[PDB]
A paper describes a structure:
Through the COVID-19 pandemic it gained more prominence by being a key pathogen in respiratory co-infections. This study will present a structural analysis of StmPr1, S. maltophilia’s main virulence factor, an excreted serine protease. StmPr1 is a member of the subtilases family defined by Siezen & Leunissen et al.. It shows the main structural and functional elements of the family, such as a reactive triad consisting of Asp42, His105, and Ser28922. The catalytic triad consisting of Asp42, His105, and Ser289 is located on top of β1 (Asp42), α4 (His105), and α10 (Ser289).
To understand the interaction of StmPr1 with inhibitors, we investigated structures of StmPr1 in complex with the well-known protease inhibitor PMSF and the peptide aldehyde inhibitors Leupeptin and Chymostatin, as well as the peptide-like boron-based inhibitor Bortezomib. All inhibitors bind covalently to Ser289, forming a tetrahedral transition state supported by the main chain amid of Ser289 and the sidechain amino group of Asp207. PMSF is further stabilized by a water molecule and Bortezomib is stabilized by the catalytic triad His105. Besides the covalent bond to Ser289, the phenyl part of PMSF is coordinated into the P1 site of the substrate binding cleft. While PMSF shows a IC50 of 125,43 µM needing a concentration of 1 mM to totally eradicate enzymatic activity and Leupeptin even shows a higher IC50 with 130,3 µM, Bortezomib has an IC50 of 1,97 µM, eradicating the activity at 100 µM and Chymostatin has an IC50 of 0,04 µM and needs 10 µM for total inhibition.
Author numbering: 1 to 356
The structure:
């Protein structure tokens, strides 16, 4: 499939480039992810973005700190509206942090997952007939572990005290987020719970050019940990690495690869603070955050394909095995000391193998 989205051809190398893309055109001949729900645990969403409308569920906001959520209270609430995660001043977050504009990360990630495709608008998305369940866990200066852990439980269809039952438990959770520290019990238990419900958990390796083993949830057991490659198909300058990294997706190499080839391009906003300060747009961003959802979306294409052919969905371990075994080996050598998994997720190869 060569969709008619106006910016797809020039911008979305991560979907269709022969060395650095994930082989989406071919995959899309088989599956677009219809009937599957992917929970995006992130900054929230811009639910009326015209290139996302129709592929979103209401979702929920798990941030239990008014100052982080930018909401009026510490309650968790239905919906996942991103209030904006800007930080106005250096050091507000921790010793040495730099002021930044709102990321709209969750809207960008949600785009990679299921941006409306072949709709004559904007960009394309990978599992563009799936639905995104946005689960807002990140706000100003990031998020709280306890919020993220409950979000995992709920997204996967487990019970959380004080939140209504999730009517739409997700086949796949994407966590484009990370922080220092080997995985704990709190994190590990939530993740184990999701796995036990049949949910594949896909996470970003992190962007510290360091060993993923030192970060969470990258270093958690049972997850698909995703490194980042460039348009060249080689490791990005920032990607984390090490034996925990299962495979890579296109994360974008940044400025060395220029514009557009250095960045992953999806739905977002140019708003510097509140949604209202800007307008709907398409943003180029680079990170293991951008790599993860390519992999998460491929998982969704696979589940969808199976369910369509009467087949059973893969269990989490089988999904990870399939994703790793079918990854395209890197077209540029990866240094021995910085392994980033078996290859670059290959949407078509994953599908072919699952449907054998
Ligand atoms: Ca579109």
């Amino acid at each position: 499939l060569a969709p008619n989205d106006p910016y797809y051809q020039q911008y979305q190398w991560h979907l269709h480039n022969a060395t650095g893309g994930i082989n989406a055109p071919s995959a899309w001949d088989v599956s677009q992810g219809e009937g599957v729900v992917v929970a995006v645990l992130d900054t929230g969403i811009l639910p009326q973005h015209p290139d996302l409308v129709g592929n979103l569920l209401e979702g929920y906001d798990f941030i239990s700190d008014a100052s982080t959520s930018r909401r009026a209270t510490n309650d968790r609430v239905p919906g996942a509206q991103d209030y904006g995660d800007w930080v106005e001043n250096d050091n507000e977050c921790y010793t040495g942090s730099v002021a930044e504009d709102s990321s709209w990360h969750g809207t960008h990630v949600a785009g990679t997952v299921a941006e409306q495709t072949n709709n004559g608008v904007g960009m394309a998305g990978v599992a563009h007939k799936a639905k995104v369940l946005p689960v807002r866990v990140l706000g100003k200066c990031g998020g709280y572990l306890s919020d993220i852990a409950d979000a995992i439980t709920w997204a996967s269809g487990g019970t959380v005290a004080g939140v209504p039952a999730n009517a739409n438990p997700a086949e796949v959770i994407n966590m484009s987020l990370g922080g220092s520290g080997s995985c704990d019990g709190t994190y590990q238990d939530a993740i184990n719970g999701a796995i036990s419900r049949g949910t594949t958990v896909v996470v970003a390796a992190g962007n510290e050019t360091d060993n993923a083993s030192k970060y969470r949830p990258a270093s958690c057991d049972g997850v698909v940990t995703v490194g980042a490659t460039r348009i060249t198909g080689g490791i990005t300058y920032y990607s984390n690495y090490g034996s925990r990294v299962d495979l890579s997706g296109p994360g974008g190499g940044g400025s060395v690869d220029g514009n557009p080839g250095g960045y992953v391009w999806q739905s977002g906003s140019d708003a510097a603070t509140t949604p209202e300060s800007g307008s709907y747009s398409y943003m180029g961003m680079g990170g293991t955050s951008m790599a993860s959802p390519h992999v998460a979306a491929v998982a969704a294409l696979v589940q969808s394909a199976l369910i369509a052919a009467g087949k059973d969905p893969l269990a989490p371990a089988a999904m990870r095995t399939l994703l790793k075994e079918t990854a395209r080996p890197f077209p540029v050598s990866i240094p021995t000391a910085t392994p980033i998994g078996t290859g670059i997720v290959d949407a078509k190869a994953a599908l072919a193998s699952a449907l054998e």
